[PDB]
């Protein structure tokens with residue numbers, strides 16, 4: 268019901284198209300479908316194609332997550348090691364506990380060092396100011412940078428922690444920090460490392476961080492169009508895109524551009540656990556709960572909060588979930604849908620992905636929306652993909 272649902276959304280003028288790529292571990296069941304049209308900077312229309320270059324936005328986080336785990340395999344990092352030396356900017360952050368009534372900020376020194384595992388699972392304390400009201404309040408009083416100067420990761424994310432390292436959960440720049448950590452410990456750019464360790468083994472050559480400079484890629488950017496002459500990804504994140512315009516260097520949190528076909532090669536290598544990217548036991552460890560007791564309780568409070576629908580990535584409020592290395596982790600079966608220990612996340616409001624090892628299925632579904640982005644419609648469209656792909660998978664299994 269992707270077919271009729273997506274077409275209805277095209278007819279209303281709220282999306283231009285969609286790219287969907289799903290596969291089992293061996294490529295027996297494969298479903299690839301490009302729907303709709305893209306618009307070129309010239310205004311001319313072209314059918315959506317499976318090798319259109321998409322803005323991944325926070326789907327970047329999974330890829331940065333793999334890159335960090337590869338440095339762990341190399342012995343350049345450990346999951347639980349002290350990062351204070353490699354990233355002193357993180358060690359220097361204090362923990363904001365709240366405000367007095369005259370609205371002055373209470374902070375405390377950090378009780379422990381920040382580790383890679385905390386960065387990868389959003390339990391370090393680094394929080395997006397637009398999601399954490401306490402951090403939103405601090406940003407505004409200790410304001411303002413209308414500097415507009417292009418900022419590196421460490422010049423962009425200068426706020427205190429939202430909670431003692433390891434003891435909470437809040438979505439934030441942990442993978443931008445992890446990406447910077449990967450650059451520092453390898454002595455090269457994040458693009459260089461990923462090209463060599465992730466894209467080359469999979470035969471991927473059509474990928475770049477913001478800003479996209481390559482002419483061949485720019486000619487295939489969905490997001491280079493009259494509504495987005497900057498190729499900022501506005502349609503994917505729903506207004507802006509502010510962080511991209513203001514950054515300098517690679518942002519492992521949200522910066523990558525990639526085709527759906529190339530993104531699913533990465534998903535499938537994890538699903539099949541074929542050693543192309545990581546040793547099997549390291550992949551297995553991604554699909555485990557890595558929040559401790561306090562952090563798990565914080566996670567569940569955020570999932571029950573008004574932001575919870577975003578944080579639940581379409582999963583039901585009755586489904587117990589944790590956070591793995593790479594995204595949300597289901598902790599029980601939903602019969603007919605995600606098996607237990609499905610890893611899932613997404614990008615902006617328009618893109619979502621899952622890796623269901625128990626049921627042997629992975630996929631990405633990426634709506635190409637029309638500004639202004641109808642957020643409630645995106646949620647529905649993503650949900651249609653997440654469930655219709657299981658329907659298609661069952662029908663195929665039944666036909667064998």
Ligand SMILES: CCC(C)(C)C(=O)O[C@H]1C[C@@H](C)C=C2C=C[C@H](C)[C@H](CC[C@@H](O)C[C@@H](O)CC(=O)O)[C@H]21
Pocket residue numbers: 323324325326397398438503504505506507508509510520521577578580612613614615616
């Ligand atoms: C730039 C953030 C990034 C990774 C692109 C992103 O897509 O995370 C997604 C993935 C999804 C699973 C869960 C999410 C959790 C909360 C949000 C609604 C977030 C989307 C935020 C984005 O819509 C607005 C930001 O761009 C704010 C800004 O413009 O600075 C959203």
